[PDB]
């Protein structure tokens, strides 16, 4: 059986605080 | 390994120290003496290196 994951399985990429920014 | 072996064939003990300079909280430091913390002035600082 199956389902669509939608927009999940994202984790914080590194242990640095950031705010009010778009990071690639 | 035998005591008669040449300088290239003799055993050597080896250690590799693998450092992790991660952006995480540090837990292994060199012997550096800490100070009191100064605020609102311009200062030189050293936080965990």
């Amino acid at each position: 059986a199956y389902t669509n994951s939608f927009t999940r399985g994202v984790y914080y990429p590194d242990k640095v605080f950031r705010s009010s920014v778009l990071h690639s | 390994f035998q005591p008669t072996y040449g300088v290239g064939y003799q055993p050597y003990r080896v250690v590799v120290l693998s450092f992790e300079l991660l952006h995480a909280p540090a837990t292994v430091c060199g012997p550096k003496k800490s100070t009191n913390l100064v605020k609102n002035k311009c200062v030189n600082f050293n936080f965990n290196g």
Side-chain angles (χ1 to χ4, degrees):
Chain A
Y2 284 99
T3 190
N4 193 308
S5 67
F6 308 134
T7 51
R8 285 189 179 285
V10 175
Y11 51 86
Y12 286 75
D14 56 8
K15 299 185 172 74
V16 168
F17 174 92
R18 299 190 186 83
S19 63
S20 303
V21 67
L22 314 181
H23 190 61
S24 176
Chain B
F1 292 119
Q2 288 159 80
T4 196
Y5 287 183
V7 70
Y9 293 93
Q10 284 166 30
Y12 289 60
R13 276 170 189 216
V14 184
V15 174
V16 181
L17 295 177
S18 311
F19 304 125
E20 54 162 46
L21 294 79
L22 317 183
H23 312 296
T27 84
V28 183
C29 291
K32 301 289 276 188
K33 187 66 172 186
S34 70
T35 67
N36 196 9
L37 167 65
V38 181
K39 292 167 178 176
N40 297 61
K41 299 184 197 178
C42 173
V43 293
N44 285 353
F45 60 75
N46 178 345
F47 284 88
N48 307 329

Coordinates of all heavy atoms in Angstrom, one line a residue:
Chain A
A1 N 0.8 -1.2 0.0 CA 0.0 0.0 0.0 C 0.9 1.3 0.0 O 2.0 1.2 0.4 CB -1.0 0.0 1.2
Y2 N 0.3 2.4 -0.4 CA 1.1 3.7 -0.6 C 0.3 4.9 -0.3 O -0.9 4.9 -0.2 CB 1.5 3.7 -2.1 CG 2.6 2.8 -2.5 CD1 2.3 1.6 -3.1 CD2 3.9 3.2 -2.4 CE1 3.4 0.8 -3.6 CE2 5.0 2.4 -2.8 CZ 4.7 1.2 -3.4 OH 5.8 0.4 -3.8
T3 N 1.0 6.0 -0.1 CA 0.5 7.4 -0.1 C 1.5 8.4 -0.5 O 2.7 8.1 -0.6 CB -0.1 7.7 1.3 OG1 -0.8 9.0 1.2 CG2 0.9 7.9 2.4
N4 N 1.1 9.7 -0.8 CA 1.9 10.8 -1.2 C 2.5 11.5 0.1 O 1.7 11.8 1.0 CB 1.1 11.7 -2.0 CG 1.9 12.8 -2.7 OD1 2.7 13.5 -2.1 ND2 1.8 12.9 -4.0
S5 N 3.8 11.7 0.1 CA 4.5 12.3 1.3 C 4.2 13.8 1.5 O 4.5 14.4 2.6 CB 6.0 12.2 1.2 OG 6.5 12.9 0.1
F6 N 3.6 14.5 0.5 CA 3.5 16.0 0.5 C 4.8 16.7 0.7 O 5.8 16.4 0.1 CB 2.3 16.4 1.4 CG 1.0 15.7 1.1 CD1 0.2 15.3 2.2 CD2 0.5 15.6 -0.2 CE1 -1.0 14.7 2.0 CE2 -0.7 15.0 -0.4 CZ -1.5 14.5 0.7
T7 N 4.9 17.7 1.6 CA 6.1 18.5 1.9 C 6.7 18.2 3.3 O 6.6 19.0 4.2 CB 5.7 20.0 1.7 OG1 4.6 20.3 2.4 CG2 5.4 20.3 0.2
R8 N 7.2 17.0 3.5 CA 7.7 16.4 4.7 C 9.1 15.8 4.5 O 9.5 15.6 3.4 CB 6.7 15.5 5.4 CG 5.6 16.3 6.0 CD 4.7 15.4 6.9 NE 3.6 16.2 7.5 CZ 3.7 17.0 8.5 NH1 4.8 17.0 9.3 NH2 2.8 17.9 8.7
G9 N 9.8 15.5 5.6 CA 11.2 14.9 5.6 C 12.3 15.9 5.4 O 13.3 15.6 4.8
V10 N 12.1 17.2 5.8 CA 13.1 18.2 5.8 C 13.6 18.3 7.3 O 12.9 18.3 8.2 CB 12.5 19.6 5.3 CG1 13.6 20.7 5.5 CG2 12.2 19.4 3.8
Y11 N 14.9 18.5 7.4 CA 15.6 18.6 8.7 C 16.6 19.8 8.7 O 16.9 20.3 7.6 CB 16.4 17.3 8.9 CG 17.3 16.9 7.8 CD1 18.6 17.4 7.7 CD2 16.8 15.9 6.9 CE1 19.4 16.9 6.6 CE2 17.6 15.5 5.8 CZ 18.9 16.0 5.7 OH 19.8 15.6 4.7
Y12 N 16.9 20.3 9.9 CA 17.8 21.5 9.9 C 19.2 21.0 9.4 O 19.8 20.1 9.9 CB 17.9 22.0 11.4 CG 16.7 22.7 11.9 CD1 15.5 22.1 12.2 CD2 16.8 24.1 12.0 CE1 14.4 22.8 12.6 CE2 15.6 24.8 12.5 CZ 14.4 24.2 12.8 OH 13.3 24.9 13.1
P13 N 19.7 21.7 8.3 CA 20.9 21.1 7.6 C 22.2 21.2 8.3 O 23.1 20.4 8.1 CB 20.9 21.9 6.3 CG 20.3 23.2 6.6 CD 19.2 22.8 7.6
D14 N 22.4 22.2 9.2 CA 23.5 22.5 10.0 C 23.2 23.1 11.4 O 22.1 23.6 11.6 CB 24.6 23.3 9.2 CG 24.1 24.6 8.7 OD1 23.0 25.1 9.0 OD2 24.9 25.3 8.0
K15 N 24.1 23.0 12.3 CA 23.8 23.4 13.7 C 24.0 24.9 14.0 O 24.4 25.3 15.1 CB 24.6 22.5 14.7 CG 24.1 21.0 14.5 CD 24.8 20.1 15.5 CE 24.2 18.6 15.5 NZ 24.6 17.9 14.3
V16 N 23.8 25.8 13.0 CA 23.9 27.2 13.1 C 22.5 27.9 13.2 O 21.6 27.5 12.4 CB 24.6 27.7 11.8 CG1 24.6 29.2 11.6 CG2 26.1 27.3 11.9
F17 N 22.3 28.8 14.1 CA 21.1 29.6 14.1 C 21.1 30.6 12.9 O 22.1 31.3 12.6 CB 21.0 30.4 15.5 CG 19.8 31.3 15.5 CD1 18.6 30.9 16.1 CD2 20.0 32.7 15.2 CE1 17.6 31.8 16.2 CE2 19.0 33.6 15.3 CZ 17.7 33.2 15.9
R18 N 19.9 30.7 12.3 CA 19.7 31.7 11.2 C 18.2 32.2 11.4 O 17.4 31.4 11.8 CB 19.9 31.2 9.8 CG 21.3 30.7 9.6 CD 21.5 30.3 8.1 NE 22.8 29.7 7.9 CZ 23.1 28.4 8.0 NH1 22.2 27.6 8.4 NH2 24.3 28.0 7.8
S19 N 18.0 33.5 11.0 CA 16.6 34.0 11.1 C 16.4 35.1 10.0 O 17.3 35.8 9.6 CB 16.3 34.6 12.5 OG 17.2 35.6 12.8
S20 N 15.2 35.3 9.6 CA 14.8 36.2 8.5 C 15.6 36.1 7.2 O 16.1 37.1 6.7 CB 14.7 37.6 9.0 OG 13.8 37.7 10.1
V21 N 15.9 34.9 6.8 CA 16.7 34.6 5.6 C 16.2 33.4 4.8 O 15.6 32.4 5.4 CB 18.2 34.4 6.0 CG1 18.4 33.2 6.9 CG2 19.1 34.3 4.8
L22 N 16.4 33.4 3.5 CA 16.2 32.2 2.7 C 17.6 31.6 2.4 O 18.4 32.2 1.7 CB 15.5 32.7 1.4 CG 14.3 33.6 1.6 CD1 13.7 33.9 0.2 CD2 13.2 33.0 2.5
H23 N 17.8 30.3 2.8 CA 19.1 29.6 2.7 C 19.0 28.5 1.7 O 18.1 27.6 1.9 CB 19.5 29.2 4.1 CG 20.9 28.7 4.1 ND1 22.0 29.5 3.8 CD2 21.3 27.5 4.5 CE1 23.1 28.7 3.9 NE2 22.7 27.5 4.3
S24 N 19.9 28.4 0.7 CA 20.0 27.3 -0.2 C 21.0 26.2 0.4 O 22.1 26.6 0.9 CB 20.5 27.7 -1.6 OG 20.7 26.6 -2.4
Chain B
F1 N 55.9 -10.0 13.7 CA 57.0 -9.1 14.0 C 58.1 -9.7 14.9 O 57.8 -10.2 16.0 CB 56.4 -7.8 14.7 CG 55.5 -6.9 13.9 CD1 54.2 -6.7 14.2 CD2 56.1 -6.3 12.8 CE1 53.4 -5.8 13.4 CE2 55.3 -5.3 12.0 CZ 54.0 -5.1 12.4
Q2 N 59.3 -9.5 14.5 CA 60.6 -10.0 15.1 C 61.6 -8.9 15.3 O 61.7 -8.0 14.5 CB 61.2 -11.1 14.2 CG 60.4 -12.4 14.3 CD 60.6 -13.3 13.1 OE1 61.6 -14.1 13.1 NE2 59.8 -13.3 12.1
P3 N 62.4 -8.9 16.4 CA 63.3 -7.8 16.7 C 64.4 -7.6 15.6 O 64.9 -6.5 15.6 CB 63.9 -8.3 18.1 CG 63.8 -9.8 18.1 CD 62.5 -10.0 17.4
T4 N 64.7 -8.6 14.8 CA 65.7 -8.5 13.7 C 65.3 -7.7 12.5 O 66.1 -7.4 11.7 CB 66.1 -10.0 13.3 OG1 67.3 -10.0 12.6 CG2 65.0 -10.7 12.5
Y5 N 64.0 -7.4 12.3 CA 63.4 -6.7 11.2 C 64.1 -5.3 10.9 O 64.5 -4.7 11.9 CB 61.9 -6.6 11.3 CG 61.0 -7.8 11.1 CD1 59.6 -7.6 11.2 CD2 61.6 -9.1 10.8 CE1 58.8 -8.7 10.9 CE2 60.7 -10.2 10.6 CZ 59.3 -10.0 10.6 OH 58.4 -11.0 10.3
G6 N 64.2 -4.9 9.7 CA 64.7 -3.6 9.3 C 63.8 -2.4 9.7 O 62.6 -2.6 9.9
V7 N 64.2 -1.2 9.6 CA 63.5 0.0 10.1 C 62.2 0.2 9.4 O 61.2 0.8 10.0 CB 64.4 1.3 10.0 CG1 64.7 1.7 8.5 CG2 63.9 2.5 10.7
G8 N 62.0 -0.2 8.2 CA 60.7 -0.2 7.4 C 59.8 -1.4 7.7 O 58.6 -1.3 7.6
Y9 N 60.3 -2.6 8.2 CA 59.5 -3.8 8.5 C 59.2 -3.9 10.0 O 58.3 -4.6 10.3 CB 60.3 -5.0 8.0 CG 60.4 -5.0 6.5 CD1 61.5 -4.5 5.8 CD2 59.3 -5.6 5.8 CE1 61.5 -4.5 4.4 CE2 59.3 -5.6 4.3 CZ 60.4 -5.0 3.7 OH 60.4 -5.0 2.3
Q10 N 59.9 -3.2 10.9 CA 59.6 -3.1 12.3 C 58.1 -2.6 12.5 O 57.6 -1.8 11.7 CB 60.6 -2.1 13.0 CG 61.9 -2.8 13.2 CD 63.0 -1.9 13.5 OE1 62.8 -0.8 14.1 NE2 64.3 -2.1 13.2
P11 N 57.5 -3.0 13.6 CA 56.2 -2.5 14.0 C 56.3 -1.0 14.4 O 57.2 -0.6 15.1 CB 55.7 -3.3 15.1 CG 57.0 -3.8 15.8 CD 58.0 -3.9 14.6
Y12 N 55.2 -0.2 14.0 CA 55.0 1.1 14.5 C 53.6 1.2 15.1 O 52.6 0.8 14.4 CB 55.2 2.2 13.4 CG 56.6 2.4 12.9 CD1 57.3 1.4 12.4 CD2 57.1 3.7 13.0 CE1 58.6 1.6 11.9 CE2 58.5 4.0 12.5 CZ 59.2 2.9 12.0 OH 60.5 3.1 11.5
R13 N 53.4 1.7 16.3 CA 52.2 2.1 16.9 C 51.7 3.4 16.2 O 52.5 4.3 16.1 CB 52.3 2.2 18.4 CG 52.2 0.8 19.0 CD 52.5 0.7 20.5 NE 52.5 -0.7 21.0 CZ 52.2 -1.1 22.2 NH1 51.8 -0.4 23.1 NH2 52.2 -2.4 22.4
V14 N 50.4 3.4 15.8 CA 49.8 4.6 15.1 C 48.5 5.0 15.8 O 47.7 4.1 16.2 CB 49.5 4.3 13.6 CG1 49.0 5.5 12.9 CG2 50.8 3.8 12.9
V15 N 48.3 6.3 16.0 CA 47.1 7.0 16.5 C 46.7 8.1 15.5 O 47.5 8.9 15.1 CB 47.4 7.5 17.9 CG1 46.2 8.4 18.4 CG2 47.6 6.4 18.9
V16 N 45.4 8.1 15.2 CA 44.8 9.2 14.4 C 43.8 9.9 15.3 O 42.8 9.4 15.7 CB 44.2 8.7 13.1 CG1 43.6 9.8 12.3 CG2 45.2 7.9 12.3
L17 N 44.1 11.2 15.6 CA 43.2 12.1 16.3 C 42.3 12.8 15.3 O 42.8 13.6 14.6 CB 44.1 13.1 17.1 CG 44.9 12.5 18.3 CD1 45.7 13.6 18.9 CD2 44.1 11.8 19.3
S18 N 41.0 12.4 15.3 CA 40.0 13.0 14.4 C 39.2 14.1 15.1 O 38.4 13.8 15.9 CB 39.1 11.8 14.0 OG 39.8 10.7 13.6
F19 N 39.5 15.3 14.7 CA 38.8 16.5 15.3 C 37.4 16.8 14.6 O 37.3 16.7 13.4 CB 39.7 17.7 15.2 CG 41.1 17.6 15.8 CD1 42.2 17.8 15.0 CD2 41.2 17.2 17.2 CE1 43.5 17.7 15.6 CE2 42.5 17.1 17.7 CZ 43.6 17.3 16.9
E20 N 36.4 17.2 15.4 CA 35.1 17.6 14.9 C 34.8 19.1 15.3 O 34.2 19.3 16.4 CB 34.1 16.6 15.1 CG 33.9 16.1 16.6 CD 32.6 15.4 16.8 OE1 32.2 14.5 16.0 OE2 31.9 15.6 17.8
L21 N 35.2 20.0 14.5 CA 35.1 21.5 14.7 C 33.6 21.9 14.4 O 33.4 23.0 13.8 CB 36.1 22.3 13.9 CG 37.6 22.1 14.3 CD1 38.2 20.9 13.8 CD2 38.4 23.3 13.7
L22 N 32.6 21.1 14.7 CA 31.2 21.3 14.4 C 30.7 22.6 15.1 O 31.2 23.0 16.1 CB 30.3 20.1 14.8 CG 30.9 18.8 14.4 CD1 29.9 17.7 14.8 CD2 31.2 18.6 12.9
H23 N 29.6 23.2 14.5 CA 28.9 24.4 15.0 C 28.1 24.0 16.3 O 27.3 24.8 16.7 CB 28.1 25.0 13.9 CG 28.9 25.2 12.6 ND1 30.0 26.0 12.4 CD2 28.7 24.5 11.4 CE1 30.4 25.8 11.2 NE2 29.7 24.9 10.6
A24 N 28.2 22.8 16.8 CA 27.6 22.3 18.0 C 28.3 22.9 19.3 O 29.4 23.4 19.2 CB 27.7 20.8 18.0
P25 N 27.7 22.7 20.5 CA 28.4 23.0 21.8 C 29.7 22.1 21.9 O 29.7 20.9 21.7 CB 27.4 22.6 22.9 CG 26.4 21.7 22.2 CD 26.3 22.2 20.8
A26 N 30.8 22.8 22.2 CA 32.1 22.1 22.3 C 32.2 21.4 23.7 O 31.7 21.9 24.7 CB 33.2 23.2 22.1
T27 N 32.9 20.3 23.7 CA 33.2 19.5 25.0 C 34.6 19.1 25.2 O 35.0 18.6 26.3 CB 32.3 18.3 25.1 OG1 32.8 17.2 24.4 CG2 30.8 18.4 24.7
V28 N 35.5 19.3 24.2 CA 37.0 19.0 24.4 C 37.7 20.3 24.1 O 37.8 20.7 22.9 CB 37.4 17.9 23.4 CG1 38.9 17.6 23.6 CG2 36.6 16.6 23.7
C29 N 38.4 20.9 25.1 CA 39.1 22.2 24.9 C 40.6 22.0 25.2 O 41.0 21.2 26.0 CB 38.5 23.3 25.7 SG 36.9 23.9 25.3
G30 N 41.5 22.8 24.6 CA 42.8 23.1 25.1 C 42.8 23.8 26.5 O 41.7 24.2 26.9
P31 N 43.9 23.9 27.2 CA 44.0 24.4 28.5 C 43.8 25.9 28.8 O 44.3 26.5 29.8 CB 45.4 23.9 29.0 CG 46.2 24.1 27.7 CD 45.2 23.5 26.7
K32 N 43.0 26.6 27.9 CA 42.8 28.1 28.0 C 42.1 28.5 29.2 O 41.0 28.0 29.5 CB 42.1 28.6 26.7 CG 42.9 28.2 25.4 CD 44.1 29.1 25.2 CE 43.8 30.4 24.6 NZ 45.1 31.1 24.2
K33 N 42.6 29.5 29.9 CA 42.0 30.1 31.1 C 40.9 31.1 30.7 O 41.1 32.1 30.0 CB 43.1 30.8 31.9 CG 42.6 31.4 33.3 CD 42.2 30.2 34.3 CE 42.0 30.8 35.7 NZ 41.7 29.8 36.7
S34 N 39.7 30.8 31.1 CA 38.5 31.7 30.9 C 38.6 33.0 31.7 O 39.3 33.1 32.7 CB 37.2 31.0 31.1 OG 36.9 30.7 32.5
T35 N 37.8 34.0 31.4 CA 37.7 35.3 32.1 C 36.3 35.6 32.4 O 35.3 35.0 32.0 CB 38.2 36.5 31.2 OG1 37.4 36.7 30.0 CG2 39.7 36.3 30.7
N36 N 36.1 36.7 33.2 CA 34.8 37.4 33.3 C 34.3 37.9 31.9 O 35.1 38.0 31.0 CB 34.9 38.5 34.3 CG 33.6 39.0 34.8 OD1 32.5 38.5 34.5 ND2 33.6 40.1 35.6
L37 N 33.0 38.1 31.7 CA 32.3 38.5 30.5 C 32.0 40.0 30.6 O 31.3 40.4 31.5 CB 31.1 37.6 30.3 CG 30.1 38.0 29.3 CD1 30.6 38.0 27.9 CD2 28.9 37.0 29.3
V38 N 32.4 40.8 29.6 CA 32.2 42.3 29.5 C 31.2 42.5 28.4 O 31.2 41.9 27.3 CB 33.5 43.0 29.2 CG1 33.3 44.5 29.1 CG2 34.6 42.7 30.3
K39 N 30.3 43.5 28.6 CA 29.1 43.8 27.8 C 29.1 45.3 27.5 O 29.7 46.1 28.2 CB 27.8 43.4 28.4 CG 27.8 41.8 28.5 CD 26.6 41.4 29.4 CE 26.5 39.9 29.4 NZ 25.5 39.4 30.4
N40 N 28.4 45.8 26.4 CA 28.3 47.1 26.0 C 29.5 47.9 25.5 O 29.4 48.8 24.7 CB 27.4 48.0 26.9 CG 26.0 47.4 27.1 OD1 25.8 46.3 27.5 ND2 25.0 48.2 26.8
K41 N 30.7 47.5 26.0 CA 32.0 48.0 25.4 C 32.4 47.2 24.2 O 32.0 46.1 24.0 CB 33.2 47.9 26.4 CG 33.0 48.6 27.7 CD 34.2 48.5 28.6 CE 33.9 48.9 30.0 NZ 35.1 48.8 30.9
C42 N 33.1 47.8 23.2 CA 33.8 47.1 22.2 C 35.0 46.3 22.9 O 35.8 46.9 23.6 CB 34.3 47.9 21.1 SG 35.4 47.1 19.9
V43 N 35.2 45.1 22.6 CA 36.1 44.1 23.2 C 36.6 43.1 22.2 O 35.9 42.8 21.2 CB 35.5 43.4 24.4 CG1 35.2 44.4 25.6 CG2 34.2 42.7 24.0
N44 N 37.8 42.6 22.4 CA 38.2 41.3 21.8 C 37.5 40.2 22.5 O 37.3 40.3 23.8 CB 39.7 41.2 21.8 CG 40.4 42.0 20.8 OD1 39.8 42.7 19.9 ND2 41.8 42.0 20.8
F45 N 37.2 39.1 21.8 CA 36.6 38.0 22.5 C 37.0 36.7 21.8 O 37.5 36.6 20.7 CB 35.0 38.1 22.4 CG 34.4 38.2 21.0 CD1 34.4 37.0 20.2 CD2 34.0 39.4 20.6 CE1 33.8 37.1 18.9 CE2 33.4 39.5 19.3 CZ 33.4 38.3 18.5
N46 N 36.9 35.6 22.6 CA 37.2 34.2 22.2 C 36.2 33.3 22.8 O 36.3 33.0 24.0 CB 38.7 33.9 22.6 CG 39.1 32.5 22.2 OD1 38.3 31.6 21.9 ND2 40.4 32.2 22.2
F47 N 35.2 32.8 22.1 CA 34.2 31.9 22.6 C 34.5 30.5 22.0 O 34.3 30.3 20.8 CB 32.8 32.3 22.2 CG 32.2 33.5 23.0 CD1 32.5 34.8 22.6 CD2 31.4 33.2 24.1 CE1 31.9 35.9 23.3 CE2 30.9 34.3 24.8 CZ 31.1 35.6 24.4
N48 N 34.9 29.5 22.9 CA 35.2 28.2 22.5 C 36.2 28.1 21.3 O 36.1 27.2 20.4 CB 34.0 27.3 22.2 CG 33.0 27.3 23.3 OD1 33.3 27.4 24.5 ND2 31.7 27.1 23.0
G49 N 37.1 29.1 21.1 CA 38.0 29.2 20.0 C 37.6 30.2 18.9 O 38.4 30.6 18.0

